[PDB]
Design a protein around this ligand. Structure first.
Ligand code: NA
Length: 290
DNA sequence: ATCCAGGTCTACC
DNA sequence: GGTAGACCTGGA
């Protein structure tokens, strides 16, 4: 694990001896949409019906608004703290072409997020800009999510399946999902009536999981890979969006290679570490606007 | 303006 | 199996 012990305080939990953990790298690498950077460098986020604030001071991480029981059963896995990222980076760095990207995002960790929230979040992500994606997700939450209080402000949890099933296509359009509104409505319908079961899909091996996710309207090869990587821990995923495409064309493939060929090339080369390789590549490419 | 952003769906050889 | 057009929105 990438930490050694924790200390439960009155208003938070302190995680000691943390390694491969930097706030900007984790929250701004593209994998999540409900974490917001604070003036002081901290980040406040909403996940699993809770508001959490995270601060990094030296080798210690302070997670506000949670206790030890919550750290053990929810947040330790949320931050993927049981995985040794030093080994991941060591293996990937054997490839000189990946070195610069790994060095740039040394503190990245792949969060273990909720399948339902992630499914809808990435359907919204298609042919969209992150700022807009964040707004749409928060609007959806404000419209039907549970009220949460933290430091004088009311935050809204992501809606339950039952509450989201109450949405009409127009409701999604109002939250500004654009043309994706119909996809979100259809998807929530299939989750609600049980046509597709997320717990079942998450239990499948990487390839079968990917195929089932593509059954959802609005989900293609890229969105499916994001969903299984970010909420189902299927690490052979290699989501090829515009940024990863650019990164791969700069290092491994020609400018006329299809996205499918790029995905297959990446998965073949990086294997079980494809998802991690993709994140370092994405973050470097987007931040440096290659 | 025309293109781009965490693409996907539809029509079609 | 592989491939041009259309598609909400809004900052550059
Ligand atoms: Na689909």
């Amino acid at each position: 694990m990438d930490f050694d012990m924790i200390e439960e305080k009155k208003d938070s939990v302190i995680v000691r001896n943390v390694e491969n953990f930097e706030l900007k790298d984790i929250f701004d690498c593209g994998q999540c949409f409900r974490w917001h950077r604070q003036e002081n460098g901290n980040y406040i986020g909403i996940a699993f019906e809770k508001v959490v604030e995270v601060q990094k001071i030296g080798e210690d991480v302070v997670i506000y608004n949670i206790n030890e029981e919550e750290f053990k059963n929810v947040w330790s896995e949320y931050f993927d703290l049981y995985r040794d990222y030093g080994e991941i980076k060591k293996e990937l760095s054997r490839d000189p072409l990946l070195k610069k990207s790994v060095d740039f995002g040394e503190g990245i960790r792949i969060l273990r997020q909720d399948p339902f929230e992630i499914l809808l979040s990435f359907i919204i992500s298609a042919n969209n800009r992150i700022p807009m994606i964040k707004k749409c997700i928060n609007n959806i939450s404000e419209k039907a999510g549970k009220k949460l209080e933290y430091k004088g402000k009311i935050y809204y949890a992501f809606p339950t399946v039952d509450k989201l099933h109450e949405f009409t296509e127009k409701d999604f359009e109002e939250c500004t999902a654009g043309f994706r509104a119909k996809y979100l409505k259809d998807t929530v319908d299939r989750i609600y009536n049980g046509e597709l079961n997320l717990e079942y899909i998450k239990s499948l091996n990487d390839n079968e999981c990917h195929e089932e996710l593509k059954k959802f309207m609005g989900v293609g090869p890229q969105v499916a890979d994001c969903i299984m990587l970010f909420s189902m821990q299927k690490y052979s995923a290699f989501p090829v969006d515009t940024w990863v495409k650019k990164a791969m064309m700069s290092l491994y493939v020609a400018p006329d290679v299809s996205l499918k060929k790029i995905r297959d090339f990446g998965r073949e080369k990086f294997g079980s570490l494809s998802g991690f390789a993709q994140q370092y590549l994405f973050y470097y490419a987007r931040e440096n606007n290659i």
